[PDB]
Coordinates of C-alpha atoms and ligand atoms in Angstrom, one line a residue:
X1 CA 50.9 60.0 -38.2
X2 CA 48.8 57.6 -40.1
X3 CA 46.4 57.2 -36.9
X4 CA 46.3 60.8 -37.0
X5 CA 45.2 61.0 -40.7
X6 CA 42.4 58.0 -40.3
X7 CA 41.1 59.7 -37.1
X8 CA 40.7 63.4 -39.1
X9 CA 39.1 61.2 -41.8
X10 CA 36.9 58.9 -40.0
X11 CA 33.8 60.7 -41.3
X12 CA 34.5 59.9 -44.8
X13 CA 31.9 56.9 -44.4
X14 CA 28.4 58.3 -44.4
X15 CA 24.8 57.6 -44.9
X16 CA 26.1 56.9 -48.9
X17 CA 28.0 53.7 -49.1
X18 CA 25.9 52.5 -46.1
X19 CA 22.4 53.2 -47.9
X20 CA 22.3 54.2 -51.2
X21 CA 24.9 52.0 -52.8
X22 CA 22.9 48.8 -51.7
X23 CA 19.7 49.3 -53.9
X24 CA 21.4 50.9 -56.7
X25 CA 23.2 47.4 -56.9
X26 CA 20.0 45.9 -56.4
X27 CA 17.5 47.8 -58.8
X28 CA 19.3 47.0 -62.1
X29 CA 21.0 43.3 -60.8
X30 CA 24.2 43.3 -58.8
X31 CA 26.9 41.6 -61.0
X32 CA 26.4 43.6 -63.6
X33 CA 27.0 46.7 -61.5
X34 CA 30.8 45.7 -60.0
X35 CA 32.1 46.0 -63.7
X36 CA 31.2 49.3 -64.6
X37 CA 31.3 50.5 -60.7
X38 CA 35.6 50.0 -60.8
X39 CA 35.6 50.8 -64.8
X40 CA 33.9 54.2 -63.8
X41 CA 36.1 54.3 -60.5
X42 CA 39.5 53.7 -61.8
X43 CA 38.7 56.2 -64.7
X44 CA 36.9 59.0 -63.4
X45 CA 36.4 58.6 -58.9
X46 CA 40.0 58.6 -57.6
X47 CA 41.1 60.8 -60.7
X48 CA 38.5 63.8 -60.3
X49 CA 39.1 63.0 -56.5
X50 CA 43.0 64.1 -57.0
X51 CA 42.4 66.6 -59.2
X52 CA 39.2 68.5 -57.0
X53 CA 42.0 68.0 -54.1
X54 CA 45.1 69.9 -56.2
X55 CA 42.7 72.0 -57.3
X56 CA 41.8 73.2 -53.5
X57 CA 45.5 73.1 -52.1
X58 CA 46.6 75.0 -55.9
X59 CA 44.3 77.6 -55.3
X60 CA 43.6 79.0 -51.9
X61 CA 40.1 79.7 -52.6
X62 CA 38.1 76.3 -52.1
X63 CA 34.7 76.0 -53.8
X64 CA 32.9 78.4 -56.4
X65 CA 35.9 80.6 -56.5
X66 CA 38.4 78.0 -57.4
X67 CA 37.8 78.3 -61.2
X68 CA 37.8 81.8 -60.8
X69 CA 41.3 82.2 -61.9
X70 CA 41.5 78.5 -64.0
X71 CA 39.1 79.3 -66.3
X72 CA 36.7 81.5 -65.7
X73 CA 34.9 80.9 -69.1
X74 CA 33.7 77.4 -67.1
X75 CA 33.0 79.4 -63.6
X76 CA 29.0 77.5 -63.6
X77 CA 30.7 74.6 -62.4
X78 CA 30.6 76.2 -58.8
X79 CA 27.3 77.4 -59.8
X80 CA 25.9 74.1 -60.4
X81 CA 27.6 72.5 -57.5
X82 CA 25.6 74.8 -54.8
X83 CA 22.2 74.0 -56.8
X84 CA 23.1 70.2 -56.9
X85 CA 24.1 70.3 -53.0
X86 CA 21.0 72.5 -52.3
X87 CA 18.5 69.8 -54.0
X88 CA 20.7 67.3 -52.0
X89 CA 20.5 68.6 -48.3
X90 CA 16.6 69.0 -49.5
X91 CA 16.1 65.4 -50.5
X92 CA 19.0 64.0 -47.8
X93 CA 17.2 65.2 -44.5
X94 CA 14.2 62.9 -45.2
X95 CA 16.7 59.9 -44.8
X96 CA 17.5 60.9 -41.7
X97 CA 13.9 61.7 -40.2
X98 CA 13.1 58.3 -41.2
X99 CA 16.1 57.0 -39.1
X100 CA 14.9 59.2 -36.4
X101 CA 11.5 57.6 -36.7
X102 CA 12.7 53.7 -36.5
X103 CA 15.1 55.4 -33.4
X104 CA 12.0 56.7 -31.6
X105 CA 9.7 53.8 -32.4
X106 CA 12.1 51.3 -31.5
X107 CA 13.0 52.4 -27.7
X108 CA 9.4 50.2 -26.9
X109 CA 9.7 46.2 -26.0
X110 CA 8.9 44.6 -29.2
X111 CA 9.9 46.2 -32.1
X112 CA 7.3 47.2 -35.1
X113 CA 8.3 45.6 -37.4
X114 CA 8.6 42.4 -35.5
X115 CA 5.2 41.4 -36.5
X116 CA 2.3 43.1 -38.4
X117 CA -0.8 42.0 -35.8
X118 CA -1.4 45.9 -36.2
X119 CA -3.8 47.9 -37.2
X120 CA -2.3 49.2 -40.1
X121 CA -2.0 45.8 -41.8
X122 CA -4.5 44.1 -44.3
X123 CA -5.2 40.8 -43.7
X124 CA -3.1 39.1 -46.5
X125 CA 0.1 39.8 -44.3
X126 CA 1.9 36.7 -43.0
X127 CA 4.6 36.5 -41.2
X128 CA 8.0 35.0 -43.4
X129 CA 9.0 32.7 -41.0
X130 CA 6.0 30.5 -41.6
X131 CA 6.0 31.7 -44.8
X132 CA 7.0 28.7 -46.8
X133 CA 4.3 26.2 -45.5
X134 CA 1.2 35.6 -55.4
X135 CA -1.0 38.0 -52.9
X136 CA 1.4 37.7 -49.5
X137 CA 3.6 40.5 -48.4
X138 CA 5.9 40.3 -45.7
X139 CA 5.8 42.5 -42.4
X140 CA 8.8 44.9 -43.0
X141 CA 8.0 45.9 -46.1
X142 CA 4.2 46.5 -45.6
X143 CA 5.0 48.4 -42.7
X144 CA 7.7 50.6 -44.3
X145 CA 5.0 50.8 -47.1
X146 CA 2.0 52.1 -44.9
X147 CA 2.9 52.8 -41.1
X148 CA 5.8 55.1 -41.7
X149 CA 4.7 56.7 -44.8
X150 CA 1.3 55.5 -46.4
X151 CA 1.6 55.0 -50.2
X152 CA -1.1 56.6 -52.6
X153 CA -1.9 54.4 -55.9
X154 CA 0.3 57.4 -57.6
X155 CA 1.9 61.0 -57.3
X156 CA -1.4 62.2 -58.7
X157 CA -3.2 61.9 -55.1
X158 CA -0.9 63.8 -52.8
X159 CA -3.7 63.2 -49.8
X160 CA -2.6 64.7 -46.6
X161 CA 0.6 66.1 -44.9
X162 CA 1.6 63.2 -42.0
X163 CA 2.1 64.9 -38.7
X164 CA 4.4 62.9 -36.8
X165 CA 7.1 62.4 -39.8
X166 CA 7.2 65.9 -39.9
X167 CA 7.4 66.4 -36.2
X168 CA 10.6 64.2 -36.1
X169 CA 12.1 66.0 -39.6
X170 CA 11.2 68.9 -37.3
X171 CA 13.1 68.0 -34.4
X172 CA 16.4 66.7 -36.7
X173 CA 16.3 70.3 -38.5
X174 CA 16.0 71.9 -35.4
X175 CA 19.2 69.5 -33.8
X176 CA 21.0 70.5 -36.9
X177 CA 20.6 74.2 -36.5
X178 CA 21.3 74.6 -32.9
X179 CA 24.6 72.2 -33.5
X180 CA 25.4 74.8 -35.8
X181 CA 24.4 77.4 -33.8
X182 CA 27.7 76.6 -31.4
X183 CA 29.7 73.9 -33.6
X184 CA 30.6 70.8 -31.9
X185 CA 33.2 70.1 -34.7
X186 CA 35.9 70.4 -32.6
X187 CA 36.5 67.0 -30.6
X188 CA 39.3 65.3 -28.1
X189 CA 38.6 61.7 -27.3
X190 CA 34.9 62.2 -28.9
X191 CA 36.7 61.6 -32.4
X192 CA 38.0 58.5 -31.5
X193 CA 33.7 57.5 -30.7
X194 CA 32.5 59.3 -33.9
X195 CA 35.3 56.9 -36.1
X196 CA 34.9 54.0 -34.8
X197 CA 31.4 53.5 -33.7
X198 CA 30.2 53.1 -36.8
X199 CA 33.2 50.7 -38.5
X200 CA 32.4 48.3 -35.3
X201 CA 28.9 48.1 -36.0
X202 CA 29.3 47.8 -39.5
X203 CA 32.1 45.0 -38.7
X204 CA 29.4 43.5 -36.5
X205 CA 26.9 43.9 -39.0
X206 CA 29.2 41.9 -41.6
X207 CA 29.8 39.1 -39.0
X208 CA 25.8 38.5 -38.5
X209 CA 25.0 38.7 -42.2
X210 CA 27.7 36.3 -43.7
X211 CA 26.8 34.3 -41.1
X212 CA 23.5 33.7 -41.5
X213 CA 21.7 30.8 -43.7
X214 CA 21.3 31.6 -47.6
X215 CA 24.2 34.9 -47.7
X216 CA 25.7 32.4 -50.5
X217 CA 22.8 33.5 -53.2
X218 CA 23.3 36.7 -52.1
X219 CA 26.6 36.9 -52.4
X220 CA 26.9 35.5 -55.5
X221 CA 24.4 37.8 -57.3
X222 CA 26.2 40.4 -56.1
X223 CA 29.7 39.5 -57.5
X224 CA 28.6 37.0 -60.8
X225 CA 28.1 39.4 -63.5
X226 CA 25.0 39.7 -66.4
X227 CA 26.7 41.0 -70.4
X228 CA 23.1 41.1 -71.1
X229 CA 22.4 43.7 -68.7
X230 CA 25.3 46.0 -69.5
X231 CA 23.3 46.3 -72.8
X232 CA 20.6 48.7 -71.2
X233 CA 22.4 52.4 -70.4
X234 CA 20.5 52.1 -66.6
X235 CA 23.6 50.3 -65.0
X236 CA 26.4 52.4 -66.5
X237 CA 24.7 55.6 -65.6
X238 CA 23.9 54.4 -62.3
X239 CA 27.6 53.6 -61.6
X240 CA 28.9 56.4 -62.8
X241 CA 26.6 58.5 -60.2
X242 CA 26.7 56.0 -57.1
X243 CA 30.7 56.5 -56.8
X244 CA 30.8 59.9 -57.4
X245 CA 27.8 60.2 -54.7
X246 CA 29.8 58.0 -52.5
X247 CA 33.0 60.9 -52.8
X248 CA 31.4 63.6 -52.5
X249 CA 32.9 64.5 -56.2
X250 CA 31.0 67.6 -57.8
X251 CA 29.0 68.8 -54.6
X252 CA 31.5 71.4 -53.5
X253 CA 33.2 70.3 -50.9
X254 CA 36.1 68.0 -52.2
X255 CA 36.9 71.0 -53.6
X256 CA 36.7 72.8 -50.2
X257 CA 38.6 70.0 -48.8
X258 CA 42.1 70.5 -49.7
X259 CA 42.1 73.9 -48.9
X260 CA 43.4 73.3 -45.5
X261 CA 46.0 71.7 -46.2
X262 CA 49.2 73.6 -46.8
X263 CA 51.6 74.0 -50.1
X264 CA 54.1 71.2 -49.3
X265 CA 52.0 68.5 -48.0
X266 CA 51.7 64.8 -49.6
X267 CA 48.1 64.6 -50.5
X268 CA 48.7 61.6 -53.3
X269 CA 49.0 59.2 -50.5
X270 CA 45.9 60.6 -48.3
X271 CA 43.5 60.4 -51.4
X272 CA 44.3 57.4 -52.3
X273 CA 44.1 55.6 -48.7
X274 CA 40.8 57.7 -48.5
X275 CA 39.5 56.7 -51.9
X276 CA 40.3 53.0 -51.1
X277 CA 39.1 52.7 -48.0
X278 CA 35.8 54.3 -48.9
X279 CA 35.4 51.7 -51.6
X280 CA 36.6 49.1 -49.5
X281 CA 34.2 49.6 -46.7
X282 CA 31.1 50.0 -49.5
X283 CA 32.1 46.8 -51.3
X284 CA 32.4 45.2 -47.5
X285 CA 28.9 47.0 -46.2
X286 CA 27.9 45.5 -49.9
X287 CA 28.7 41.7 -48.7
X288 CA 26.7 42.3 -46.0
X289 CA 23.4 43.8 -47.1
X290 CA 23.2 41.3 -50.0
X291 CA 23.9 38.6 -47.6
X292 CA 21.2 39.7 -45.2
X293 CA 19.0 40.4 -48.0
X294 CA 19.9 36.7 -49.4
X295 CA 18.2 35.3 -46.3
X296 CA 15.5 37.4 -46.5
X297 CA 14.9 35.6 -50.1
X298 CA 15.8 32.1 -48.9
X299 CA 12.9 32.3 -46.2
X300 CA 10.5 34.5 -48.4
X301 CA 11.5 31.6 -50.9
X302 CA 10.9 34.5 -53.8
X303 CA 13.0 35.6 -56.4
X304 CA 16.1 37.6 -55.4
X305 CA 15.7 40.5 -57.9
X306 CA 12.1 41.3 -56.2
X307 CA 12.0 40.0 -52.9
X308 CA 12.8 43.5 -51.4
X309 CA 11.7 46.9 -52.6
X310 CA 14.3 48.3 -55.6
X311 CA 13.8 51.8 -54.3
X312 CA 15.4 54.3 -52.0
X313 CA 14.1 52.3 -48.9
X314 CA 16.2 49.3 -49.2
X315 CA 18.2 49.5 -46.3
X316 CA 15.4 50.0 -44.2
X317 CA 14.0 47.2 -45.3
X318 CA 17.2 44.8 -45.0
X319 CA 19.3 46.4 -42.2
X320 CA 16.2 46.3 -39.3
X321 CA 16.1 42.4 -40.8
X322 CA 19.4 42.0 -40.1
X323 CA 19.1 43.7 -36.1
X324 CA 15.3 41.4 -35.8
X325 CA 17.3 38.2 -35.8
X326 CA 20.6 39.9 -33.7
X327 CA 20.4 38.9 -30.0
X328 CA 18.5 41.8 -28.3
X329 CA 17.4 43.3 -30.5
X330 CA 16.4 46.4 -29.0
X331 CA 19.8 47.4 -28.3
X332 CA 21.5 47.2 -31.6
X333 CA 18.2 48.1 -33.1
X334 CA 19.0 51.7 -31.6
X335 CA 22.7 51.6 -31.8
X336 CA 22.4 51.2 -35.1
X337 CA 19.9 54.0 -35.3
X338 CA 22.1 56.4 -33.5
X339 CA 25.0 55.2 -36.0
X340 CA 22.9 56.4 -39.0
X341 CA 22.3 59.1 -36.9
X342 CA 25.7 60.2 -36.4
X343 CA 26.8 59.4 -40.0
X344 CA 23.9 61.3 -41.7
X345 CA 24.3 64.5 -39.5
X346 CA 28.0 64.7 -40.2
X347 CA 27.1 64.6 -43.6
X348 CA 24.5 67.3 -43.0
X349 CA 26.7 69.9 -41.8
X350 CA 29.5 69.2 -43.9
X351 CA 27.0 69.9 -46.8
X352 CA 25.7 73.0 -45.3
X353 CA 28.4 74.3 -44.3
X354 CA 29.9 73.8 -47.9
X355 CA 26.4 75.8 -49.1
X356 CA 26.3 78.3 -46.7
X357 CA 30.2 79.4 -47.2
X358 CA 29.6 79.2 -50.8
X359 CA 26.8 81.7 -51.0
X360 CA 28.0 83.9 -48.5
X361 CA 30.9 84.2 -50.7
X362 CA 28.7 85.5 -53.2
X363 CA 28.1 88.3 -51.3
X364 CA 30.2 88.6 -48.7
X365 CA 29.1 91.9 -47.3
X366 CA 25.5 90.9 -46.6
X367 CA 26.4 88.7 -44.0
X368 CA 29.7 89.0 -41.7
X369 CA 29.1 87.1 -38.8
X370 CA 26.9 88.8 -36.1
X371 CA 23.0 88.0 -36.2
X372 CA 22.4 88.1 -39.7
X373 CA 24.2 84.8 -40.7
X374 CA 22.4 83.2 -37.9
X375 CA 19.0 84.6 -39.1
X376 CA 20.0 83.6 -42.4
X377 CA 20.6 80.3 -41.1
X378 CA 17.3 80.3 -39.7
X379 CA 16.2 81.3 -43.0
X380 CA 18.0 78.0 -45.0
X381 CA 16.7 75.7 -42.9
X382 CA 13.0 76.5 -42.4
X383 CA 12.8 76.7 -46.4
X384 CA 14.3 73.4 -46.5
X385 CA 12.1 71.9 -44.4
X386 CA 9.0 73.6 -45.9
X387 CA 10.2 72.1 -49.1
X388 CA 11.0 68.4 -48.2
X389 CA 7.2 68.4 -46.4
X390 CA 6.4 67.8 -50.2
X391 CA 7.7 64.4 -50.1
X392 CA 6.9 63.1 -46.4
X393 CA 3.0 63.5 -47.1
X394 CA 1.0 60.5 -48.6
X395 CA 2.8 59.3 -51.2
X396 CA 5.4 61.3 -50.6
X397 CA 7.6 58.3 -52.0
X398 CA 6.9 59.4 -55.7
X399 CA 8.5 62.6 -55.5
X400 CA 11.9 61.7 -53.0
X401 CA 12.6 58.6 -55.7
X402 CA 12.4 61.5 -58.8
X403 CA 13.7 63.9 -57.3
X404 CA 16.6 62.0 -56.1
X405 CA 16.4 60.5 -59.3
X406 CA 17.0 64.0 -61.6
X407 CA 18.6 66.1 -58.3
X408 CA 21.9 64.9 -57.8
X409 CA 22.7 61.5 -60.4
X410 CA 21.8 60.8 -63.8
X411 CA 23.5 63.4 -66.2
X412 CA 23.5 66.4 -63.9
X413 CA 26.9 65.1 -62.1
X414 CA 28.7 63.3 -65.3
X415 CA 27.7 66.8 -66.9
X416 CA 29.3 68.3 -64.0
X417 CA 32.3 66.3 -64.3
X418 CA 32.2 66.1 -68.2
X419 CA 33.1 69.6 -68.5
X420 CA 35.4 69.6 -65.4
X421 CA 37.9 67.1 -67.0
X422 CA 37.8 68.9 -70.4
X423 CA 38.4 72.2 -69.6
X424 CA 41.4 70.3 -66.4
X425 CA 42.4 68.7 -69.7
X426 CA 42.5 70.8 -72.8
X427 CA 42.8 74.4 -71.3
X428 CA 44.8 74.3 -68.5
X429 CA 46.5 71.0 -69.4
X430 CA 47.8 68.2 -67.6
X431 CA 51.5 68.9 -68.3
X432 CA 51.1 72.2 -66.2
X433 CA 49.3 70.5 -63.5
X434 CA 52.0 67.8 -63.1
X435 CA 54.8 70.6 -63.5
X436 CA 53.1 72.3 -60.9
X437 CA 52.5 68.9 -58.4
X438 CA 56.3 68.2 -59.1
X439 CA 57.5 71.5 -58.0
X440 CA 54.6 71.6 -55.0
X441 CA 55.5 68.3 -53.9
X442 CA 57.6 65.6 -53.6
X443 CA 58.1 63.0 -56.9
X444 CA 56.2 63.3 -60.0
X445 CA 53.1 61.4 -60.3
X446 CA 52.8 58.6 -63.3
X447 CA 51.1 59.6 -66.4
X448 CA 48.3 57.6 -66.1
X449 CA 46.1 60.0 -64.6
X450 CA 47.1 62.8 -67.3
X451 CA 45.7 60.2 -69.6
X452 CA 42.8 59.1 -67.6
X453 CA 41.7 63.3 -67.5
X454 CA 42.1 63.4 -70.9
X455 CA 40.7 60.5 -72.4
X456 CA 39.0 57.9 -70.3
X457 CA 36.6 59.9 -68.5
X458 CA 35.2 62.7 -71.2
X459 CA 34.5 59.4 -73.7
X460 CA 32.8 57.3 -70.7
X461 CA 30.5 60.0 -70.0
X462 CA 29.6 61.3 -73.6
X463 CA 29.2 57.4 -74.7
X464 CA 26.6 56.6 -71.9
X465 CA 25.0 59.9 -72.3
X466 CA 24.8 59.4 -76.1
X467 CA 24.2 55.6 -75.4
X468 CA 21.0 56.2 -72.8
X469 CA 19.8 59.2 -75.2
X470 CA 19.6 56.8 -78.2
X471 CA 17.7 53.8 -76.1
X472 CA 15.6 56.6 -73.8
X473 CA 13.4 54.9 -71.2
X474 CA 11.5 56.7 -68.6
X475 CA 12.0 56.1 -64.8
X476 CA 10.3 53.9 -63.2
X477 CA 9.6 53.0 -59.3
X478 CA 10.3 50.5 -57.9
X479 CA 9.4 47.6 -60.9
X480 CA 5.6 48.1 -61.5
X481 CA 4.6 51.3 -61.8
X482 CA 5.3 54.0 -64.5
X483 CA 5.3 58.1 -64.0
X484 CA 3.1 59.7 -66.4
X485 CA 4.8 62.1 -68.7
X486 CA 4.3 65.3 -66.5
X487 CA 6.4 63.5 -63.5
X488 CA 9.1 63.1 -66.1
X489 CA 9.3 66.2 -67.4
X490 CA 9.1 67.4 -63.5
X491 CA 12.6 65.8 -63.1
X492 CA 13.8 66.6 -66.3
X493 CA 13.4 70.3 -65.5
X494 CA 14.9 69.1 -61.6
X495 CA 18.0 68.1 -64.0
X496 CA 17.9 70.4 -66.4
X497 CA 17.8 73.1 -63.5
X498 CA 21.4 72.2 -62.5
X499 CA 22.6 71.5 -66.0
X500 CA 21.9 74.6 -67.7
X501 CA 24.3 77.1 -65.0
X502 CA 27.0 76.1 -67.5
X503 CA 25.7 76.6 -70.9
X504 CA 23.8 80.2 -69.4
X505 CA 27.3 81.5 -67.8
X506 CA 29.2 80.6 -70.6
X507 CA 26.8 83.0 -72.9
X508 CA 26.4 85.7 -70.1
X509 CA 30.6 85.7 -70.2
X510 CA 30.5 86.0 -74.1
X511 CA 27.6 88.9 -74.4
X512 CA 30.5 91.1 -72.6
Ligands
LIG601 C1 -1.4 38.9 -32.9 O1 -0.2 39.5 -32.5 C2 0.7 38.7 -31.7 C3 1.9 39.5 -31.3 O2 3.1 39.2 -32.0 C4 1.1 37.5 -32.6 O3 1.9 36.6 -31.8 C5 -0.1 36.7 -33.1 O4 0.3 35.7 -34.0 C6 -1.0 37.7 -33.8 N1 -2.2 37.0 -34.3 C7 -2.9 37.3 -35.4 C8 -4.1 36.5 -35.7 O5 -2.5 38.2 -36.2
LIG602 C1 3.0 24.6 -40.7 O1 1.8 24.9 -39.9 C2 1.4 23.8 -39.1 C3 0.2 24.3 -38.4 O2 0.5 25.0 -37.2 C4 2.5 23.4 -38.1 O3 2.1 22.3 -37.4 C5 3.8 23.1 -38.9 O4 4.9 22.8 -38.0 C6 4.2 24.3 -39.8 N1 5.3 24.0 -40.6 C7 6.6 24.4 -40.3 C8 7.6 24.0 -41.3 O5 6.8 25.1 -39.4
LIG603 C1 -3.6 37.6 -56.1 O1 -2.7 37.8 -57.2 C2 -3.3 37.2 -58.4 C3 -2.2 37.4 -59.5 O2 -1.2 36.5 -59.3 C4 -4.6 37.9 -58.7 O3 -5.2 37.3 -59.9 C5 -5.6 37.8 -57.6 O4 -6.8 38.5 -57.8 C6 -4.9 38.3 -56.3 N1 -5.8 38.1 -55.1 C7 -6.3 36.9 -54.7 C8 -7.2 37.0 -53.5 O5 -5.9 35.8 -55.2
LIG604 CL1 30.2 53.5 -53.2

């Protein structure tokens, strides 16, 4: 029953609320970000999350095919999906090759990053512990700065390809597509490993970081909010992305989701346990990074908002802290690993196989099983990997941050969902929808969320779309250095890439 429905969804958790979530708290200040985070949830996460969901049981057809016969004037929204999950299984893989990287370089005695007596390490490193005793740098971040990807001064000087970051992003494609090539989906007693391996090391996790010296600080910047800061439009268009990111809301495969089940099943109570317990378990995995990051200030005795890097490699930097000080730390150091591991390959195929049904769809007489959809297969994934080698070279920072910057967040995915809850909203209605829930299933679901369609999404994305419009800043990594103008308009064109399928099929639909 219920341990039947936790068990099927025990890989809701993923590489999201475990990574990403942490230093998009972090980059724009972390109270700040709660208050906009469950604004954005409560109006828009769990709502388009219910509504992608009766949209998939509804309709049989589960993905681009679902508008098909809701409204097909706004059919790009499937369109856009598959180029927003296509930029993210290109930008995604790279977390996990770094993962695979720590994994590999971690099976010797002493960790890397233990100390930075190396030889890729300038002479003004010192070690934090004797750190308190404007030029010093600590050991984890000037490794994860240099050693596993060496930083050019900008995106201008792409120097030259690294060999063994692509040899391990090698060696996770190929993984991929030969777990693909037989599909070890289907699981006995291997389920109840996959769903609870990660919780207990998160749990674990938890128990060494509010335990440790200094998680107070942490703690407290994470939950005591900043008005000031809600002034800039950076933190409410960073929440409204990270929960949709952390739902998989707009990529294709919600949508897909609720296809399985069958016309008379209760799926108000499983989205909302699911939706809860995924924001439970990222405000939890929250508590514990900014408590392990808290210590990391109290011995770097530095300021809090720029003691770590506020980019994509946050948890890299914070979550091999947290295993240094753990007892042993070679073995959790590389069950952790194989945890992000696990997490971010389940992920993987989910997303691919989301993609790959999609466009097969599209045309579903080039490829009916056989050879051909392995070849194609073949195909997806050496593209991919010939694509992502652009930001695993030297500097290869510049372009992952932008890219995941304009791919899949900003205003491609409150676009996305902008025009989804209108069209939900003011076409096919939200008396219809609760007509038809009523007569699907059993009791009839409050108003509130006919309301919340209607009203308190659409205006929360148009006013911070209008709102970051009128007080436009360009992106910036990390805190001191600024793209020039043709790296902007690079991932404005990323964006616009993704945001355009709705405006171009609506006009292709109204020339005939
Ligand atoms: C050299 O590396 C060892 C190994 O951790 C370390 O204990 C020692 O402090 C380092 N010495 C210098 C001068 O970097
Ligand atoms: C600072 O360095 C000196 C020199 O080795 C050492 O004696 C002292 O214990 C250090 N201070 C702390 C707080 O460890
Ligand atoms: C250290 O940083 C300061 C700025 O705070 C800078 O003026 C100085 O040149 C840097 N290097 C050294 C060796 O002090
Ligand atoms: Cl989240």
């Amino acid at each position: 029953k219920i341990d039947f429905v936790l068990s099927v969804a025990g890989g809701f958790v993923g590489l999201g609320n475990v990574w990403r979530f942490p230093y998009l708290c972090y980059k724009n200040g972390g109270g700040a970000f709660l208050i906009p985070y469950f604004i954005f949830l409560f109006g828009s996460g769990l709502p388009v999350f219910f509504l992608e969901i009766i949209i998939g049981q509804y309709t049989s057809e589960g993905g681009i095919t679902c508008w098909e016969k809701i409204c097909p004037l706004f059919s790009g929204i499937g369109y856009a999906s598959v180029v927003i999950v296509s930029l993210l299984n290109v930008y995604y893989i790279v977390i996990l090759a770094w993962a695979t990287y720590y994994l590999f370089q971690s099976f010797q005695k002493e960790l890397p990053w233990a100390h930075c007596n190396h030889s890729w390490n300038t002479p003004h490193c010192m070690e934090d512990t004797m750190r308190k005793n404007t030029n010093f740098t600590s050991p984890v971040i000037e490794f994860w700065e240099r050693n596993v990807l060496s930083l050019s001064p900008g995106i201008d000087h792409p120097g030259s390809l690294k060999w063994d970051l692509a040899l391990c992003l090698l060696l996770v494609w190929l993984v991929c597509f030969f777990c693909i090539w037989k599909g070890v989906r289907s699981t006995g007693k291997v389920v109840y490993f996959t769903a609870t391996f990660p919780f207990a090391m998160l749990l674990v996790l938890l128990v060494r970081g509010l335990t440790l010296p200094g998680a107070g600080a942490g703690i407290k910047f994470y939950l005591y909010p900043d008005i000031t800061r809600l002034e800039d439009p950076q933190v409410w268009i960073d929440a409204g992305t990270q929960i949709f990111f952390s739902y998989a809301i707009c990529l294709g495969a919600m949508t897909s989701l609720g296809s399985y089940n069958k016309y008379k099943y209760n799926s108000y109570r499983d989205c909302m346990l699911l939706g809860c317990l995924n924001s439970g378990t990222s405000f939890v995995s929250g508590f514990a990074i900014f408590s392990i990051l808290g210590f990391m200030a109290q011995e770097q005795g530095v300021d809090i908002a720029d003691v770590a890097e506020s980019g994509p490699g946050l948890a890299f930097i914070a979550y091999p802290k947290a295993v240094t000080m753990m007892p042993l730390p070679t073995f959790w150091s590389i069950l952790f690993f194989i945890m992000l591991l696990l997490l971010g390959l389940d992920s993987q195929f989910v997303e691919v196989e989301g993609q790959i049904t999609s466009l097969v769809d599209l045309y579903p007489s080039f490829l009916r099983k056989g050879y051909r959809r392995e070849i194609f297969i073949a195909f997806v994934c050496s593209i991919s990997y010939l694509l992502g080698l652009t930001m695993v070279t030297e500097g290869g920072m510049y372009v992952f941050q932008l890219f995941d910057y304009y791919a899949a967040s900003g205003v491609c995915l409150l676009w996305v969902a902008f025009f989804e809850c209108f069209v939900i909203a003011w076409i096919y209605g939200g008396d219809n929808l609760y007509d038809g829930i009523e007569d699907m299933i059993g009791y009839r679901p409050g108003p509130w969320m006919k309301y919340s369609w209607a009203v308190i999404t659409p205006v929360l994305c148009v006013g911070c779309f209008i709102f970051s419009l009128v007080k436009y800043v360009p992106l910036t990594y990390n805190k001191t250095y600024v793209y020039p103008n043709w790296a902007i308009g690079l991932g404005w064109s990323l964006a616009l890439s993704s945001m355009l399928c709705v405006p171009l099929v609506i006009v292709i639909r109204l020339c005939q």
